[PDB]
Each structure stands twice: as structure tokens, then as C-alpha cells.
Structure 1
Amino acid sequence: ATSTTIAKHIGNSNPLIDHHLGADPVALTYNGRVYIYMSSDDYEYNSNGTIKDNSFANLNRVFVISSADMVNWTDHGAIPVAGANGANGGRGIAKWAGASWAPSIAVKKINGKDKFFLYFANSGGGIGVLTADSPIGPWTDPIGKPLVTPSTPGMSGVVWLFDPAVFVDDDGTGYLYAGGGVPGVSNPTQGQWANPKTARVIKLGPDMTSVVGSASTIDAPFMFEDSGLHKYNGTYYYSYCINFGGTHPADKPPGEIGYMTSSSPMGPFTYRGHFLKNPGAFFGGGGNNHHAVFNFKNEWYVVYHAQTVSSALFGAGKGYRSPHINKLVHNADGSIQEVAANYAGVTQISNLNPYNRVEAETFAWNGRILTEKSTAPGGPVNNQHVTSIQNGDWIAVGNADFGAGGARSFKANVASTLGGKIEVRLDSADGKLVGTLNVPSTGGAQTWREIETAVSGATGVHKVFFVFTGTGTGNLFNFDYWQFTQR
């Protein structure tokens, strides 16, 4: 192992991923996994190949990752949401939409079957929705145009119609929160900064792809954007990013996450405080806040973004964002403690079972690879592979539990022009070697073979490193999935 981690260091849980970016995160909790959906931040370049500032040109897909344990993330690749102005190569799902910003996600049992709803902002041109039968798709546009526009009843007054947050209440009723922006265009008055009145909540129909009645105004003081709704102990918590303009009182600090409570999902809400400081208060690279509060495996957390990957790569954040998660604490009086955002992040909550098929694109740490959609036959929905593997690169999983009996062998599905090796190491990238898998020439980068090799010394709970070596300079092989066999 020679390659180093960009930003997510071995033993640390933030950022969630660093092999690519992901902005404006939101969380779905579903059947033992947490899925994070993100805006498709990707590095933009000047004509001479130098990095430039993010201009949101690439924000036309939704990136999806998931975890059972908060440390190992499965990369589910990208939903080609926007389909206007070319797609997505003609493959965009929402043909009327040029962008898909700031996704929100919901699940609802309909007709005794779980259905999934992905919402997004078409820049400021309105909020759309796609549906699927799985949290990872495939996705359908059941409407063919925005779900909500400025002409939706109650939506008049919204300056920026974006950052959706959709909540399915305990009675099954869906609610959409959206909006932001500050009225008064170039120079808002002090009062316009303090009460923009651009936050909205609208009740959704039973089908989650229509609205009922009109939108209500949520008078979020110093509203900016980044609506959020969670429900704790019977109380609804509307959270949002506070704006940066005008003078601000001590209790409504610019750019921090504010929150309000109500006994009803549509209000009236009462301002309670703030629980997340600006990204730059904790990290390198600065940036504006975006967040979602969620309860996964019976603990409360907040997913948010920071510019921690671009900052490490370039020495400035340049508007490129990455996901983070930290614990969120409610007090006895229903207030929320300041979120201690950091790199350490959340300690692994359960072990990984190495004896099932584990996607190669399920990993906790990596020393510089990429993931992309795979040509491998079979595999889960939107199956990816690990690629851009050069000599010295590696990936690692946290706390694989080999058990007392330990592993007998190691299988890997690979595709290779020239061939190479996978070293299986415990604890560190230079750690105990338990096996070496010889990757043959398989016929090329799109011809797959599952290879098996011996393992010994793999018992109990360890980080596991897959260290890639070979003589070639470019790409040694593509790596789809692996599996250990029990002794």
C-alpha cells in the first residue's frame, strides 16, 4: 500500500465517502440500512485542465450510497434524474427537468407494498418526483412535469422554490416542505431578512405524487433554504438554514441550522434555537449548510455537507461538497444540543459479515480508486465496480467478523486486460497477509471471472484491506464483488 486517504482517514467516519463528491444529503432509513441521496457534485475544469469553482453545471443526477453500520458504504452509483437539454446522454428520467438539486426521499406502504418517492428541485423551476419499487430504483416519472410550481396554491410568495423535504407522518399522511430565498431582490430590508416568509408546507395526496389544498407559510425567522422535518416524542421539528444577511440576534446566528417546533405538521411552528454551526466553524474549505435529521437503528443523527474532500485535494473547498454524519441529541425539555461536527464521526454500530457476497464498492476507506456502473453480469440494481486501480491502491472494510472458525478461501469477481494481484490484509494496509489472489487476464475490462484463493489466519473481528498490485501503469483490473468461505 502506497496510496493515501484523501479526507476520510482509517478509523474515521467523516466524510462518509471521499472517492467522489456528494452534496445536499438526505437520509432514508429502510429495513436495517440508511440510504443517503445527494446532489451530483463533480469537479469542473477550465479549458486548460485546471480546477475551477463549482458552478452546479453537473447537478443533473442523484448519487446514492447506503450503510448498515455507519462506516462501510455501498456505492449505488447515480440516478440519471434530469432528462432535458440532452440528459444524461438521452437516459434522463425526468424529460422536463434540466437539473435535480437537493433530493428528498420517502417510503410509504401503498396497497400493502413499500413504494419509494424521490423528490428534487429543477433549479428554481419547481419540485419533481420519481417513484420506484426499491430505494435504489429503477425510477419512473409518473407525472411528466413538476409536482409543485409557483402556481401551486399557497406557493405564491416563495423566492426560491427549492430544497424539498418530504415527511410521511405516522398516520400515513405525506407532507412537503420547500422554499427559501429572501424577498427584496438586490437589497432586502432588515425586516425582509428577518421574516422572508418564503418557507412553505403543503399536504401531499395519498399517492405521494400530488398535493391536497394549498401551501401554508412557515414564518421561519431569517429563513434561507434547506428545509428539514423530523418528529420526536410527538412534536414536529421544522429545521432550516438561517440566512447571512441583515443584522441577526445572538439566538439566530447567520448560516446555522435553526429549528422550530409544533404539535401539528403544518404549524403553527415556534422558533426554538439552532443546533449546527457553519461548516467552516469546524472544517477547512468553508461552505453553506445543508442537512437532514433522522433516526437509524434507534439513534438520532444529522446528515450534513462540508467541503472536506476538495479542501484536502486543492487547498480550497471551491464549492464542492461531501457528506458527513454526526449524532444528534434531544434534551428532556425537547431542545436539541449543538451538533459536535467532526472527522471522527459515528463509531461502527455493527460488524460486517464477510461470508455473504460483499460488493467491492462496499468499503469504509480507500487509497484512491473510483467506482462506476459495471458491465458484470448479475449483481444488484445499478451494480457498480471498483475501477481506476493502480499499483499501490487499496480499499478497506471496517470490522469484518470472521468468527472463531475463520475463513477458508476468498473469491473476487474481476475483469482484467493484463492481470495483477489482490492482497488480503488484516488491520492495516501493511498488515497481516491472509491471502493473495492472482488476477488473470480475463479477456479485457468487460470480461468477468470469479477467482478463488486460499486464506489462513483470518479469525475474529478486523478491518480488512484489499491491496492491489501489478506491473502495468494504468488500470490493473476492475473489481465487482468478493466473498469469503467459512473454514
Structure 2
Amino acid sequence: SATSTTIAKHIGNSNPLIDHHLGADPVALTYNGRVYIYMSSDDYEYNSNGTIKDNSFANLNRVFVISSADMVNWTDHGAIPVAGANGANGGRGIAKWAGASWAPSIAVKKINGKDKFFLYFANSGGGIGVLTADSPIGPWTDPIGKPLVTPSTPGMSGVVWLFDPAVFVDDDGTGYLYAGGGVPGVSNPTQGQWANPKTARVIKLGPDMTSVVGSASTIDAPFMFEDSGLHKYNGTYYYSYCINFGGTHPADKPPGEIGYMTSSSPMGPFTYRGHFLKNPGAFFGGGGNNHHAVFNFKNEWYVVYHAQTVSSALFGAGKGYRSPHINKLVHNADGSIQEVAANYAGVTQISNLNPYNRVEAETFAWNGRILTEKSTAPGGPVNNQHVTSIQNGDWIAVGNADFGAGGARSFKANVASTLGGKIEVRLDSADGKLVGTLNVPSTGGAQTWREIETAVSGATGVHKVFFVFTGTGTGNLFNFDYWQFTQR
């Protein structure tokens, strides 16, 4: 009954994090037991004849957000319509001054006893903006109505590409913004311009995280290119960035790789240490921009980065379209960082999923091959999505659902369907033990939602769980908002 194949994130593998769409320039928020990943909205551009053309970043006007409690099952929180200029996101789009929202950065700060969230983004190469929210997934407000940082921000002149923000809230509650990149000398930098672009910047933020304090300092990242990052390990601040591709490079600053520098203060002085992530081309073939954030989630150090692993699998060429990956990052006893072993296997699931809570359908580890959108389902979480583009033989799967010793009694699915179909609930594999079959009736339409219940038996212990979609003809069989098992 399950016939569709995984594009790039194969069952058992944790990279790329998702493959049912793209997501470039990832950054991580760790918050109340979940990692959020916020991403540039990579999205295929097409020639007029419907063939794919190389990514020119034309579609980078949203921020894609996924989250996980376990590194394997990703809840799709959909898209934040950040860019509102030109104009389009069809209306919708939150920062009216910004035509683009590249390379997000995310921070949370408790203000007046309430957690407040701050999403930073680059309006292409021209400035940094910020949105605010009372939850990591929104809804979002543009407090300011203009960029937060421009070339006129003190200290920011001399930056070639005023982009790739990284916002770090220090242990004392002070925010810092790292930004910049590009290489001076336009079409022909001299060797020395390659070697010391002097286009990286850090600026301190005001307490409210929507203003700057003082002037930006230059970080002299050798062979700076883009992709500022900041993490703090054992009291030391690590400024990381992508090394440029031009000029001759010494062996210790290899082109297109992630370099890093350390300092005992967030604003420097920084000393190059420092490379830990080869170009994604070195691992997955070969190659492109390289774009990364280091974070600690549930007591482990990771780097999120991107690679052209979904587009290459679909097209035979990555064409600049990028997908998020995570691997472990290891700090040595001396504080240096080991080369990250970027791969497909990725990170092993760190905790089980509880299938007795409401679980969004768009919370899955693997799929073949569906889409997620914006749902009309009543209620649900902020920016509630559903699984759609469900055809016969499609499926989604969660990793390590723990049904417990007693096991499940029933399975509920919130579904909307014009003609109906089935959800087969299978353990371990797409062709695995059938524990139940939910008959999706005609509900009256794709926006008319019914919670359907069906019996489950044989579902005990920890398993991958596959929801295999079947139906006749069509089209879209149904959309698929959330599910919940009952005990026992």
C-alpha cells in the first residue's frame, strides 16, 4: 500500500531534517524542551517552460519554521510571511519595508516576567530587520516598521553585504548582533582584500532587543565571507563564519569552509582558531554557499547547516537550493572544535514521542511524498498546518512513538476530505504491522473537519509509526491535521 520513496531523508536517517520542502540558512532556538529551526524560504524558481533554474534567491521572502523535541520528528510550523514589500507575500507579509527575509536569527528574552521572541532577518544585502512575538511561532509584529540596522548604523560602514545576522542573548541578558560579509574590491579583490575583508561586525543590542547600543565593532575574520554565528562554550565566545572562495588561501583557512574565532568577550577581540565545517560540496558534492549555526539542545552541542541534498536528489544538480542538516559539534579539551562529520545519518533520536497527546500530522520524521500547508482546521496551535498533497501510496512516519506497555486502544485523526480514503496505521515500516485503519469519510470538503476515531490493537512499546494513505483516483485524498491515540 505504501509506494512513494523518500527524496533525500531516508528512513533511519536524520539528515536532511526535512525533505518535503527546502530550507536554507538555518538557525536554532532552544526553548522549553524544543529546538526551533528557522530558515530562509528556499523555493524553486522556474523558467517559463517549467524547468528549474538556478536559485537566484527570488523566493526568500518567508521564514520557514520547524521544531522538534527529539532531533528526528519535526513539527512543521509553516512559514512566517516576513517580507511585505513588492508586495506580496500577497498582502500578508509582516515587514512592509522588506522585499526579502534572508538568513533568519532568533532570540528569546524574558521581559517583565514574560518570554519575548525576536526574529531577525536580512533584507537581502542591505539591512537587518526584526519581528517580535509572544511565542516562538508567532504571531509576529514589526515594532519598528524600518530596518533595525542599515549601512548608517554607527560602525556599519565598510560592510559589503549587510546581511546574515546572528543575535545572541548573553547569560547576563545582553543581546548582541553579528552581521556582515562580502569582500571589498568588487569584481577583482586584491589578494589582501580576499585575506582581510573586514566586513564582519558586532553591535550590542538595547535591553528590549529592538534597538542597538553604541557602535558596531569590526571582527577581522580572516577570509571573511558571510554567515556570522555566535555560540558560547565554557565561558568563551566563538564567532564562526563562512570563509570566502577567492584568492589563494593558506591551509588553515580553506575556501568555503566554516572558520571560527574565540574571545573572552562577545564583542572581541577575536582570534582565529579555527575551521570546523567543510563546504557541503566536500560531503555531498560539490558545492555552494555554506551556512551554519551552533547550538546546545538538551545538553548536546550541534551545528545546523545547509546542503543541496534534496534538490540534487530530485534534479541531478543542487542548483543552489538548500536543505537543513544537523550534526553533532565537538569541542575539544583545549576549546578547539573538531571537524564536523557532516553526513546523512545525522543525529539519533534523543527521546520518544508520546502518541497519546494530540500530535500534529505535520509532525513527522520521514515522508514519501507529501506537502504541508496552512490549515483551515478549527482550533489547533499557532499557524496550524496540515499534511496535504496526499495521494494513494503516500505516507508519513514518526520515529520512536512510545505506546507504553498497555498500548493503544484507538486512533483519532482530524481530517477533511471530499471523497474519502484510509489511513493505515503501521509499525516500524511503510509495509509494517497494521495496527489500525482509519476510514476517512467524505466530510463535505477539504475544509470541513471531522475527528474520526478507529480501533487500534497490537500497538505497544516503541516503534516508528507509519501513516499510509490510500484511496482511489484523485487528486488530494484528504488533509490530515492532527492525530491522537487513546490508551490502552
Task: Compute the TM-score of the two structures, normalised by the length of structure 1.
Answer: 0.99
CA offsets per residue over residues 62-121 of structure 1, 9 Å max, x none? Answer: 000000000000000000000011121111110000000000000001111110000000
Structure 2: distance between partners of 1:336 and 1:92:
39
CA offsets per residue over residues 326-345 of structure 1, 9 Å max, x none? Answer: 00000000000000000000
Structure 2: distance between partners of 1:217 and 1:394:
50
Shift of 1:52: 1.2
Structure 2: distance between partners of 1:204 and 1:221:
25
Q: Is the 8 A contact 1:418 1:472 kept in 2?
A: no
RMSD: 0.6
Structure 1: distance between partners of 2:28 and 2:482:
25
Structure 2: distance between partners of 1:86 and 1:238:
35
* Range 438-447 or range 285-294, more displaced: 285-294
Shift of 1:224: 0.2
* Range 44-53 or range 177-186, more displaced: 44-53
Q: Is the 8 A contact 1:285 1:316 kept in 2?
A: no
Q: Secondary structure at the residue paired with 1:193?
A: helix
Shift of 1:287: 1.9
Q: Which residue of 2 aligns with 1:160?
A: 161
Q: Is the 8 A contact 1:284 1:316 kept in 2?
A: no
Structure 2: distance between partners of 1:367 and 1:94:
34
CA offsets per residue over residues 332-366 of structure 1, 9 Å max, x none? Answer: 00000000000000000000000000000000000
The share of aligned pairs that are identical, in percent, is 100
Shift of 1:473: 2.7
Change (3 A) 1:356 1:285: farther
CA offsets per residue over residues 256-301 of structure 1, 9 Å max, x none? Answer: 0000000011110000010000101110462211000000000000
Structure 1: distance between partners of 2:382 and 2:439:
28
Structure 1: distance between partners of 2:147 and 2:305:
26
Q: Which residue of 2 aligns with 1:181?
A: 182
Shift of 1:43: 1.2
Structure 2: distance between partners of 1:124 and 1:337:
31
Q: Which residue of 1 aligns with 2:4?
A: 3
CA offsets per residue over residues 207-250 of structure 1, 9 Å max, x none? Answer: 10000110001000000000000000000000000001111000
Structure 2: distance between partners of 1:7 and 1:25:
18
Shift of 1:134: 0.3
Q: Secondary structure at the residue paired with 1:281?
A: helix
CA offsets per residue over residues 194-218 of structure 1, 9 Å max, x none? Answer: 1100000000001100001100010
Q: Is the 8 A contact 1:285 1:307 kept in 2?
A: no
Q: Is the 8 A contact 1:284 1:311 kept in 2?
A: no
Shift of 1:165: 0.3
Change (3 A) 1:243 1:285: closer
Q: Secondary structure at the residue paired with 2:66?
A: strand
Q: Which residue of 1 aligns with 2:144?
A: 143
Q: Secondary structure at the residue paired with 1:115?
A: strand
Q: Secondary structure at the residue paired with 1:310?
A: helix
Change (3 A) 1:264 1:352: same
Change (3 A) 1:285 1:475: farther
Corresponding pairs, count: 487
CA offsets per residue over residues 366-417 of structure 1, 9 Å max, x none? Answer: 0100000000000000000000000000000000000000000000000001
Shift of 1:472: 1.8
* Range 52-61 or range 289-298, more displaced: 52-61
Task: Compute the TM-score of the two structures, normalised by the length of structure 2.
Answer: 0.99
Shift of 1:51: 1.3
Structure 1: distance between partners of 2:449 and 2:417:
8
Point out 4+ residue stretches in structure 1 off by more than 4 angstroms: none
Gaps of 5+ in 2: none
Q: Is the 8 A contact 1:8 1:365 kept in 2?
A: yes
Matched, 1:28 2:15: no
Q: Is the 8 A contact 1:285 1:308 kept in 2?
A: no
Structure 1: distance between partners of 2:364 and 2:174:
36
Structure 2: distance between partners of 1:234 and 1:419:
57
Q: Secondary structure at the residue paired with 1:129?
A: strand
Q: Is the 8 A contact 1:94 1:141 kept in 2?
A: yes
Shift of 1:44: 1.3
* Range 284-293 or range 425-434, more displaced: 284-293
CA offsets per residue over residues 23-59 of structure 1, 9 Å max, x none? Answer: 0000000000000000000111111111111111111
CA offsets per residue over residues 127-180 of structure 1, 9 Å max, x none? Answer: 000000000000000001000000111001101100000000011100000000
Structure 2: distance between partners of 1:460 and 1:342:
29
Q: Which residue of 2 aligns with 1:397?
A: 398
Alignment of 1:254-293 (within 5 A): 254-284=255-285, 286-293=287-294
Structure 2: distance between partners of 1:453 and 1:183:
64
* Range 469-478 or range 337-346, more displaced: 469-478
Structure 1: distance between partners of 2:224 and 2:207:
29
CA offsets per residue over residues 296-315 of structure 1, 9 Å max, x none? Answer: 00000000000000000000
Alignment of 1:81-120 (within 5 A): 81-120=82-121
Q: Secondary structure at the residue paired with 1:447?
A: strand
Shift of 1:474: 1.1
Q: Which residue of 2 aligns with 1:221?
A: 222
Q: Which residue of 2 aligns with 1:446?
A: 447
Q: Is the 8 A contact 1:366 1:395 kept in 2?
A: yes
Q: Secondary structure at the residue paired with 1:302?
A: strand
Q: Secondary structure at the residue paired with 1:430?
A: coil
Q: Is the 8 A contact 1:3 1:367 kept in 2?
A: yes
